[PDB]
Every structure is written in C-alpha cells, then in structure tokens.
A paper describes a structure:
[name] ([name]) is ubiquitously expressed and is a central regulator of the innate immune system. Upon binding of the respective ligand, TLRs (except TLR3) and receptors of the IL-1 (IL-1R) family signal via [name]. In this process, ligand–receptor binding is associated with recruitment of myeloid differentiation primary response 88 (MyD88) protein to the receptor, where it interacts with [name] forming the myddosome. In summary, [name] appears to be indispensable in TLR/IL-1R signaling, and activation of the [name] pathway is associated with inflammatory and autoimmune disorders such as atopic dermatitis, lupus erythematosus, hidradenitis suppurativa, and rheumatoid arthritis.
Further SAR exploration (details not shown) led to the identification of compound 41, which exhibited reasonable potency and good selectivity against FLT3 despite lacking a larger front pocket substituent. Compound 41 inhibited CYP3A4 (IC50 = 2 μM) to some extent and was therefore deprioritized for further optimization. Its cocrystal structure shows the pyrazole ring in a tilted orientation relative to the methylbenzimidazole core.
Author numbering: 163 to 194, 197 to 215, 222 to 336, 341 to 459
Write the structure that this text describes.
Amino acid sequence: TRFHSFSFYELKNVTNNFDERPISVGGNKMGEFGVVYKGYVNNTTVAVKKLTTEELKQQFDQEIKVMAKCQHENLVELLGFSSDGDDLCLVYVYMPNGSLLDRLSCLDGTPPLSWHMRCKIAQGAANGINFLHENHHIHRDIKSANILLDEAFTAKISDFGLARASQTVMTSRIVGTTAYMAPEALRGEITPKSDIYSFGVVLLEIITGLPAVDEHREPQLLLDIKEEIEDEEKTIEDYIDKKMNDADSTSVEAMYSVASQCLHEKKNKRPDIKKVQQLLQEMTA
Ligand SMILES: Cc1nc2cc(-c3ccn[nH]3)c(NC(=O)c3cccc(C(F)(F)F)n3)cc2n1C
C-alpha cells in the first residue's frame, strides 16, 4: 500500500551489505527478534530491521498488519519491507536518539534526560499505547528498549511482531520480558491490562534511571521498590535519578502514583491507558 516493496539486494546496497560492525566504528549496526541497521535511501536516513522460520514470518506479517492500521506521532513509521527467501527486512523512519533505555543509561556519553523531557516521553509513550488499545491491539512487550526517541526526543513505541488483537484469552506460548511482564501475563493471560503493568515499570525506569533488572543489585527487579516504599523501608526520593536538576517532588511523586497504580498485582484494579494519559497530562498542568 503506502509501504515500498524493496528487494533484499536493494536493502543490502542501502546498509553497506548489512555491515554488522557498530555505527561508532563505521559499520551500520545501531541496535538489536533481529538487528537494526542504519540505511540511506537518497537523502533519507532509515532504520532497516533484518529478522522458528514460519513463526518469524508471522511476526513479520503481524508488524506490517499493525503498521498498516496504526499510524500515530508516538508510534514508529514503516516506510517498507523485503520478503526475499529466508531474509525478512522491515524499513522504518530513522530515530536519531535511539532507545529510552540507551538515553536513561546515558550510553555513548549522551547527556542525561531532564525531568521535563522525561515527562514528555512518558506522555508520548502513553499516547502511543492508547492508540494501539483504541485500535484493539496488545503490544505484549512494552519496555524502555522498545520506546525510541526522534530528533525532538518524541517517544515512539516499536516492535509489534508479537502484538495481538483484542474477552481475555490464554496462550500456550508465553512471550515478553520477565522484568516488565505482569503476573497474569507470566501465567499466559493476554490482556491490554498487562501492557499497563509493563508501562508502570517504564515509568519507574524514567523516575530512577535504573534498568528493570540488574544481577548485581538489591532489589534485582525494579518493580520490587514499590514494596520497599509501601513498607516505608525507603522513600521515592531515595530512588529518584540523581542525574537531574529540574525534578520537583510534587511531579515525581505524581508519576510514581501512576506507576504504583499501573503496578497493581490485580489486573482489574490497574488503571486503563486513558486514565494513565489523563493522570500524566494533569502531572504537567
Ligand atoms: C544512535 C542510535 N541508536 C539506535 C538504536 C536504535 C534501535 C534500538 C533498538 N532498535 N533500534 C535505533 N532504531 C531506529 O532508528 C529505529 C527506528 C524505527 C524502528 C526501529 C525498529 F527497528 F526498532 F523497528 N528502529 C536507532 C538508533 N540510533 C540512531
């Protein structure tokens, strides 16, 4: 439709024959169910994601199905694709500032995100999840690594390969990232309410600047700090990222309130994305 059909050979020419060397050393590999390569079509920089074989083809076809129906400022934009043999490629609009994970970790010496930018990213990401949920899709892998940032640090949700259409069902194949996954999701339930839980973990990543899981940490899983703060063992202020100078307590506590609500172990007691949107909008009012 709107999507250009590339040959693998065209995308090989765009990506310097899919140079797996990092962009920093002069290759085309930017990040990693596949590797994301930098591409040049004319005067447009693009991101080329090269991905069981029939199950990969389903994730490919799903991404195209979702990206065909879902177009929104807080979602990545598919420019085209390539289906030539056992080599499946998806071409998107280039995101100059990479993933939220990378920027929260200040990877490659990038400056720390201000509270103001962090609040806009949270709102953007929420607006993107709202669009997917309004259009009866469940992401099933909402994480900081799947939230990409454009030139204006506008949040764009990515990776809809495992996305499901939405009456809560169950699955034999349990997918997602443990550190972000809700209890029912880990048990095989498929609900948009599980996406909310995962976002709660992302809101804690934004507040703390800490990764969802760290082997050499206590607690190892970031979601466990909710208990420490509820059992008055620690405070939110003890966990607030020290790499910010513009974080007012009222606003940080307000985002934690949403994160805590999002992270209710009872699916039905979690807020819907529309409420998450409203609460985060009120936070910046
Ligand atoms: C310095 C730097 N690091 C980067 C990391 C990624 C990155 C992290 C994880 N996947 N891709 C990235 N991604 C994209 O441009 C992009 C854009 C749209 C869609 C995708 C898709 F493939 F994920 F669907 N990727 C750009 C990056 N830049 C410019």
